[PDB]
Amino acid sequence: PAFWCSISYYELNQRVGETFHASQPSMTVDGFTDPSNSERFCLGLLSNVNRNAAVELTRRHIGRGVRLYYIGGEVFAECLSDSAIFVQSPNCNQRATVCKIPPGCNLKIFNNQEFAALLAQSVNQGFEAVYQLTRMCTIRMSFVKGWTVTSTPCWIELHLNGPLQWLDKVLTQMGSPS
């Protein structure tokens, strides 16, 4: 996939900034006021007229944030911030729980071997069963405070394009012969 994922930033229930499209296998999402580029999604420059003290307080603790890694269809997250990050990944929980990644730690947030196995099995269950897997292609992550997700001050939503494109391909193959 051209862009392995798209990342959208949120402040409580408010969408902030444009969607980040990841083209590099490794990149960071941090709270710095630097311009974003292919290797970093910087949340510090983003403005929000309706931003309260709670959100601005959290934003100051993001720091180095999180480094995301894409390899072999798998996705890993590493907490660079000195405050923890919290991930809600259906695929990860498949082994709605929120995982806490403390400072300096790492976790595989998307297992493509697990996904492939669930996909092969889901085909036998029908179109709807395969489509249900789209839910594992969306991962939410919050900075500093864990958790609805709209109740956390700073969070991002990732959409994994590789798995989604694969699901599209399979669903297409399931076209009824009639």
Rounded Cα gap, residues 84 and 101, in angstroms: 6
Stated as kind and residue range, the H or E segment containing 166 is helix 161-173
Rounded Cα gap, residues 2 and 161, in angstroms: 9
CATH number at residue 58: 2.60.200.10
20 contacts 36 by C-beta, under 8 angstroms: yes
DSSP 37: B
Rounded Cα gap, residues 84 and 64, in angstroms: 11
User: Domain limits at 48?
Assistant: 1-178
Closest CA to 99 of 79, 114, 72: 79
Annotated resolution, angstroms: 1.9
- Half-sphere exposure of residue 124, counting CA atoms within 13 Å on the CB side? 4
Rounded Cα gap, residues 17 and 145, in angstroms: 20
Which residue type sits at 77? A
Rounded Cα gap, residues 108 and 5, in angstroms: 15
Overall domain count for the chain = 1
Rounded Cα gap, residues 43 and 62, in angstroms: 9
Structure tokens at 27: 């990149």
